[PDB]
Amino acid sequence: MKYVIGIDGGGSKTHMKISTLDYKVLLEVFKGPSNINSSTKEEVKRVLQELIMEGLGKLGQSLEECSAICIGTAGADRTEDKSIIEDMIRSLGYMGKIIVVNDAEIALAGGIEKREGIIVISGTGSICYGRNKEGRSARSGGWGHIIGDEGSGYDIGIKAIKAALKSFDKRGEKTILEGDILDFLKLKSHEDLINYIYRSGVTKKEIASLTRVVNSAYIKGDLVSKRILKEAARELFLSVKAVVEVLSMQNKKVVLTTAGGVINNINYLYDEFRKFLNLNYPKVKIISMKNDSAFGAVIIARSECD
Numbered sequence: 001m002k003y004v005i006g007i008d009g010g011g012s013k014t015h016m017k018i019s020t021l022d023y024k025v026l027l028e029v030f031k032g033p034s035n036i037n038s039s040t041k042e043e044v045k046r047v048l049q050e051l052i053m054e055g056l057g058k059l060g061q062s063l064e065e066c067s068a069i070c071i072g073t074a075g076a077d078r079t080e081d082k083s084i085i086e087d088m089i090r091s092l093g094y095m096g097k098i099i100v101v102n103d104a105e106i107a108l109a110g111g112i113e114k115r116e117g118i119i120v121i122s123g124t125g126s127i128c129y130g131r132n133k134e135g136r137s138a139r140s141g142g143w144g145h146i147i148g149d150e151g152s153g154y155d156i157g158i159k160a161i162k163a164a165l166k167s168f169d170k171r172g173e174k175t176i177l178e179g180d181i182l183d184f185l186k187l188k189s190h191e192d193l194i195n196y197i198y199r200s201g202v203t204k205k206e207i208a209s210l211t212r213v214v215n216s217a218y219i220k221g222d223l224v225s226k227r228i229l230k231e232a233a234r235e236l237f238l239s240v241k242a243v244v245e246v247l248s249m250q251n252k253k254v255v256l257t258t259a260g261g262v263i264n265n266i267n268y269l270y271d272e273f274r275k276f277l278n279l280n281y282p283k284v285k286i287i288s289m290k291n292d293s294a295f296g297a298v299i300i301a302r303s304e305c306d
């Protein structure tokens with residue numbers, strides 16, 4: 001009757017799996033993404049509570065037989081932030097073990113099924129996290145949508161808008177993004193981007209969705225869009241180079257995987273990223289994720305149980 005909960009607090013959705021102790025996933029639940037750096041504490045708490053309560057309703061059991069909860073979330077990697085998320089879950093009256101980690105850590109667990117390896121996330125945000133054979137971890141990037149997230153979908157979306165505006169106002173190279181962005185957002189004029197960006201409650205996910213427009217334009221031969229994708233791939237490579245160097249893995253066999261809708265969806269960006277790794281770190285073996293991040297959280301939670 002015992003079970004564990006794994007929660008992926010990702011940049012695109014919050015995703016929960018409830019699993020037996022023999023790794024049979026009984027059910028899953030999806031809610032909107034919720035990050036303490038882009039939502040209020042009260043709003044993040046409400047998302048997490050609704051997520052868990054919905055799953056418990058489908059399960060037909062309370063938290064009493066839940067042996068462990070692992071949440072890997074964007075936005076809460078610092079010691080005080082982990083306490084903030086832990087308190088949100090304790091607010092449900094949960095009495096068991098709570099493991100708070102970052103979203104890269106659960107992507108590593110789910111993707112590689114081991115403690116050692118490197119993960120790059122590029123979805124709404126971006127980060128690189130790794131752990132070497134010595135068990136030491138490092139991260140680069142991951143500084144959020146204002147002071148970081150280079151090479152993320154949010155960054156690509158902002159850069160697409162800026163390129164469209166420079167095309168329109170004559171500061172930059174002509175690009176079909178000029179009109180394609182307006183068409184995607186159903187806006188008549190570039191002036192309408194002001195109300196859209198500053199006065200409509202636009203979300204990070206909505207901005208990141210413009211990556212689709214950049215990919216479509218690249219496939220139509222647009223040179224500015226190709227450059228945006230190439231530069232994003234380079235930023236993601238730099239995040240790997242930093243972690244590899246910090247962890248002393250420049251000359252060592254390492255397994256690397258990738259998570260998020262930017263790095264995993266765009267053929268050209270993925271290929272450029274892989275080309276950088278294959279040339280500079282040929283002993284890095286690149287694989288696809290064996291399981292999703294929510295299952296990685298299940299692994300972390302269940303592994304702490306007898």
Ligand SMILES: CC(=O)N[C@@H]1[C@@H](O[C@H](C)C(=O)O)[C@H](O)[C@@H](CO)O[C@H]1O
Nearest residue numbers: 074075076077102125126127142144
């Ligand atoms: C400040 C912030 O929100 N950074 C988040 C990252 O969170 C890290 C763990 C952190 O909080 O330091 C997250 O890994 C990446 C990928 O999803 O997206 C960034 O936007």
